[PDB]
A paper describes a structure:
Two additional structures are presented of the pH1N1 endonuclease with bound mononucleotides rUMP and dTMP, components of the RNA (and DNA) endonuclease substrate. The only compounds that resulted in structures were dTMP and rUMP, both of which gave large, well-ordered crystals in a new orthorhombic space-group. Apart from the obvious differences in the ribose and base, the two structures are essentially the same. In both cases, clear anomalous scattering exists for the two manganese ions and the nucleotides bind with two oxygens of the phosphate completing the co-ordination sphere of Mn1, one of them also coordinating Mn2. The base is well stacked on Tyr24 and Lys34 makes a hydrogen bond to the O2 position. The ribose is stacked on Ala37 and Ile38 of helix α3 and the hydroxyl groups do not make hydrogen bonds to the protein. This is consistent with the fact that the protein is a DNAase as much as an RNAase. Unlike some of the diketo inhibitors, dTMP/rUMP exhibits a very well defined, full occupancy binding mode. The apparent optimisation of this binding might reflect its biological significance as representing part of the natural nucleic acid substrate binding site. The green tea compound EGCG and the mononucleotides occupy pockets 3 and 4.
Residue numbers in the entry: 0 to 54, 72 to 139, 141 to 197
Amino acid sequence: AMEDFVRQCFNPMIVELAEKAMKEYGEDPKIETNKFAAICTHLEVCFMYSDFHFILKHRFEIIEGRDRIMAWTVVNSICNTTGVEKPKFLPDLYDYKENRFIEIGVTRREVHIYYLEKANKIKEKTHIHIFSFTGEEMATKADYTLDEESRARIKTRLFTIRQEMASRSLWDSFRQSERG
Ligand SMILES: Cc1cn([C@H]2C[C@H](O)[C@@H](COP(=O)(O)O)O2)c(=O)[nH]c1=O
Ligand SMILES: [Mn+2]
Ligand SMILES: [Mn+2]
C-alpha cells in the first residue's frame, strides 16, 4: 500500500524521476517501498527549495533528479565557471547567490543525527540544510538560506505527508525504516 500511497500522493513527474533514480542505483521501488517514498519526498523538497527563487535567472541549479552523468556534467560546469571547490560527492543544489553547493536532508530521526551523517561524509564548503517531519530544521552555521515563508511551505508539505501516512497506517513503518 506504500506503493499506492506514493503514486496517489506525489506528482507523477516526481514518482517517474524517483523510479528512474532507483533503477540507476539497482534498487526496486516495488520492494524498497519506504525508500521509494523517501526519495520522492526528498526530490519534492529539492524542487520546492528551488521553485520561485530568482536573481530572471534561477537562483538555484537543481542537481538532484538528474542521472550521475548529467549531474557531474552540471557540477563540473559550475565549478569551472565559478571557481568554487569541487565536491567529492554529488550535492542537491547550487546556489548562484551565495555561490555554494547545498546538500538537503529530509529525516524521520533527530535532525542533528542526519546533519552529522552528511557532515561526516562531506569532509567541506558544501552547505547542509536538514528538514524533519516534525517541523525542525538544522543548517550549517544556523544559515537557512531561504526566507522564512519558503521554509514554512516545505515544512507544511512534510507535515501533510506525515499526517496522510499515519491515516493509512504507513507512518510507523516508514519512520523506523530510516538508517544511515
Ligand atoms: C546517493 C543515494 C541516495 N539515495 C536516496 C537516499 C535519500 O532518500 C535520497 C536523497 O539522497 P541525498 O540526501 O543523499 O541527496 O536518495 C539512495 O537510495 N541511494 C544512493 O546511492
Ligand atoms: Mn542528492
Ligand atoms: Mn540530499
